[PDB]
Design a protein around this ligand. Structure first.
Ligand SMILES: Cc1cc2nc3c(=O)[nH]c(=O)nc-3n(C[C@H](O)[C@H](O)[C@H](O)COP(=O)(O)OP(=O)(O)OC[C@H]3O[C@@H](n4cnc5c(N)ncnc54)[C@H](O)[C@@H]3O)c2cc1C
Length: 418
């Protein structure tokens, strides 16, 4: 492997793009990224108007990520240090999650005062939590993803996007190694190293030995009237581990993005084999139960918006490892394959930095203690509890399945790939 080696990245999502960017920064000149959707991909979990950005191996990686948001001029424009409320309703939730910038809240009036009067009109019944006044906030996830991809491209990376030209249909398996990939147009992409960064779809392409559970969450937007927008500007991110979270309205459309908290949805599919796999799919709607949960959250916080029609809704997929640690490693058998996946529903904040760790994995530079946590680890996924809620709360307090969903929302379509 040399700086001019053919390198192939499967997936131009959060981590594929971070990888492309960091390969280019570190001087690689022959990188190609494949994706079935134009950047920003409509199925990328990173393609969102906002994500929560906050802030031991996890502390090291989180520190590097946050440093990118604060100090890397490519990423700085997208980060808003609004502060963040982290709250819960039960002791179990509170347990789950001297700093001068952290305050405890236990009283409804304290919650209401986190925003200008007229914004947080709710009763916050039994809400208790911690408010970080700074050093946490939100990033414009889609704009940051696009910025990173365009900077990678500027530095020589070739993005081949859209279907069929960017849709990988198989990796090239030759003499027990991965030699590249083949796209749906029937084009062979040979590479000295292949990075698998297909997020929730990564399991399509090889046997992860139960290490990945593709799992989906839910989001909506509510459009504020032009007059009512100013009042909601610069509010801190409001997050309750057992209810959901929301952000100040975006600029483009004055839309407040809201997520209901729950342990997620799988889509378990039965093969002729009889084996069981969670298979992701695009849907620009959410289950009716998710709508209900969103509206119950709004009742408790911004009741004046609780009955407003949604302007956009979608499911959003990631993939959980058995302990929600990342899966970033060289494959133990396929010498040329590098995994950059298992973001476990928490990978967006690592956009500025995770590509460095993935490249380090390819190059054999990962510190041993870090490697031990993120390595290929089938032992951890043996006898897997696929219904493990993995520290997630809300709604049914169980992992549910889309096969059980009877009714979906019927919100207007929007093409978020532009
Ligand atoms: C609703 C929701 C809320 C979240 N909240 C936060 C948060 O507040 N903060 C945070 O840090 N994280 C959050 N996350 C987690 C974060 O979004 C993800 O962990 C991260 O974006 C996943 O990155 P990834 O690169 O693994 O996958 P993705 O960004 O999803 O990218 C995968 C790419 O693989 C591509 N692909 C699929 N099939 C093929 C194929 N056949 N060939 C080639 N490419 C293919 C897709 O088109 C996609 O672009 C949230 C996620 C969701 C869904």
């Amino acid at each position: 492997v040399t700086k001019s080696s053919s390198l192939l990245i499967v997936g131009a999502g959060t981590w594929g793009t971070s990888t492309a960017l960091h390969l280019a920064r570190r001087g690689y000149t022959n990188v190609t990224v494949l994706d079935p959707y134009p950047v920003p991909s409509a199925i990328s979990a990173g393609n969102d108007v906002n994500k929560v950005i906050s802030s031991e191996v996890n502390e090291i990686l989180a520190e590097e990520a946050f440093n990118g948001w604060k100090n890397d001029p490519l990423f700085k424009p997208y980060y808003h240090d609004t502060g963040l409320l982290m709250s819960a309703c039960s002791q179990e939730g509170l347990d789950r999650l001297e700093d001068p910038n952290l305050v405890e809240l236990t009283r409804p009036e304290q919650f209401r005062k986190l925003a200008p009067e007229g914004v947080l009109q709710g009763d916050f019944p039994g809400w208790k939590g911690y408010f970080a006044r700074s050093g946490a906030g939100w990033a414009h996830a889609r704009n940051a993803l696009v910025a990173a991809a365009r900077e990678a491209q500027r530095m020589g990376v070739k993005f081949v996007t859209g279907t069929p030209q960017g849709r990988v249909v198989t990796l090239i398996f030759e003499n027990n190694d991965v030699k590249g990939a083949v796209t749906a147009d029937g084009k062979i992409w040979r590479a000295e190293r292949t990075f698998l960064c297909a997020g929730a779809s990564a399991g399509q392409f090889l046997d992860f030995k139960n290490q990945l559970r593709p799992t989906a969450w839910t989001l909506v937007h509510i459009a504020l009237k032009p007059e009512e927008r100013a009042l909601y500007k610069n509010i801190p991110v409001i997050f309750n581990i057992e209810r959901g979270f929301f952000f100040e309205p975006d600029e483009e459309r004055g839309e407040i993005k809201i997520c209901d908290e729950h342990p997620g949805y799988t889509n378990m599919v039965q093969s002729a084999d009889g084996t069981m796999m969670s298979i992701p799919f695009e849907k620009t709607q959410i289950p009716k139960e998710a709508e209900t949960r969103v509206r119950a959250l709004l009742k408790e916080t911004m009741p004046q918006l609780a009955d407003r029609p949604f302007s956009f809704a979608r499911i959003c997929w990631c993939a959980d490892t058995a302990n929600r640690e990342f899966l970033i490693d060289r494959h133990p058998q396929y010498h040329s394959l590098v995994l950059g996946c298992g973001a476990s529903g928490r990978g967006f904040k690592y956009l500025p930095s995770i590509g460095n760790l993935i490249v380090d994995a390819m190059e054999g530079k990962v510190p041993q203690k870090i490697h031990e946590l993120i390595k290929w680890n089938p032992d951890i996924a043996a006898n897997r509890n696929w219904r493990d809620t993995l520290g997630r709360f809300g709604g049914p307090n169980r992992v549910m399945d889309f096969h059980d969903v009877k009714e979906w929302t019927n919100v207007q379509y929007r093409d978020i790939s532009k």
